[PDB]
Amino acid sequence: ENIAPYKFKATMYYKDVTVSQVWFGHRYSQFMGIFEDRAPVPFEEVIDKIN
Amino acid sequence: SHQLSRADITTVSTFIDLNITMLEDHEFVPLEVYTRHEIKDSGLLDYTEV
């Protein structure tokens, strides 16, 4: 029995979008939030631009 | 009359032939249906690797 998974190479195209909110105090700077998101790369951008 | 070599006379066998052969030295190879590796790879994800 083939317990081994079917393995194949794939390519993940995505854009790490990090929006950081920063508060600037008098003598210091502090992160008040870091929204990290992963956006898909459109087909028109994978074919025309990346490839 | 004359002398005769033994092989010149047919010999009848008074012995019962009991043929016993030893069991061949047999070597057992390491055989595993799935190795500890194959089994670890069988997992669709490994948390460690991920």
Q: Describe it for me?
A:
The structure is cut from a larger assembly and holds 2 copies of chain A. By secondary structure, the first copy, chain A, is α+β, with helices and mostly antiparallel strands. Helix content of chain A is 16%, strand content 45%. A two-stranded antiparallel sheet of chain A has the order 1-2. The two termini of chain A are 39 Å apart. The A-B interface holds A 3-5 and B 34, 38-39, 41-42, 44. The PDB classes it as viral protein.
Shape of chain A: elongated
Number of strands of chain A: 2
Give the structural class of chain A.
alpha+beta
Tally the helices of chain A: 1
> Which two chains have the most extensive interface, and how many residues on each?
A-B, 3 and 6 residues
Provide the succession of SSEs of chain A: EEH
Helix % of chain A is: 10-25%
Sheet with the most strands: spatial strand order of chain A: 1-2
Q: Kindly report how far apart the N and C termini of chain A lie.
A: 39 Å
The major β-sheet of chain A equals: 2 strands, antiparallel
The amount of beta strand of chain A, in percent, is over 45%
- C-alpha-based Rg of chain A, rounded: 20 Å
What is the oligomeric state here? Answer: part of a larger assembly
